């Protein structure tokens, strides 16, 4: 059980500071900072709750 | 080190303290 730290200086649980656990070839676990989850575009009609298909979100 | 300042004024005896009161 390795209690590990950050690798940056923002020491708060901000939306720009979301991490994920990753195992390395050095046999230790480390934080990797996740990219923020983007969303698919919405139609110009304004009447459909779903998002468009075929476009990379 | 700097010169120590004078001991503060302890608002010790007055209306608020019941530890010793005169005839009133």
């Amino acid at each position: 059980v390795q209690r590990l730290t950050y690798r940056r200086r923002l020491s708060y649980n901000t939306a720009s500071n979301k991490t994920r656990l990753s195992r390395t070839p050095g046999n230790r676990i480390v934080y990797l900072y996740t990219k923020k989850v983007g969303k698919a575009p919405k139609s110009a009609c304004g009447v459909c709750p779903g998002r468009l298909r075929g476009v990379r979100a | 080190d700097p010169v120590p300042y004078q001991p503060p004024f302890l608002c010790q005896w007055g209306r608020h303290q019941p530890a010793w009161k005169p005839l009133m």
């Binding site: - | 120590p4 001991p7 503060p8 302890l10």
Partner: protein
Amino acid sequence: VRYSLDPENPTKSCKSRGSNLRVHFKNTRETAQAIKGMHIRKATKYLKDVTLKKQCVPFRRYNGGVGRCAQAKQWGWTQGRWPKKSAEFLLHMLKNAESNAELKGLDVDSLVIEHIQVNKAPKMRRRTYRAHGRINPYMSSPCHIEMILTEKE
């Protein structure tokens, strides 16, 4: 330098002093009054007994709150304590005085301490923080010691 009570016969008398010695003045004066008048070997044995807590030093003038012991009945007093730092420092000073007598060419085992004087030194100031945000002095009181041995046997 000058001393108090200069010796009558400086040929058969040696001298030794020490300035700004960070000891306690009262303990040093009491062990100096205990050591004053003895032979040099009896004096070193007495200071080793003070260090090993076998013979004590009677506190005769500065005896405020000083506990009693059984060993002070050799001196005819009630209070008694064993000043270790004082005994060691004016044991080193007797070692220096014996070396000075050896340099002058004096007989070692015939030396009697004729004069000893313990004066106060300039105090070493420090502080202590007490209640309600106040700062009071915390003053070391060191001593100047000077002594003369004389061939008296």
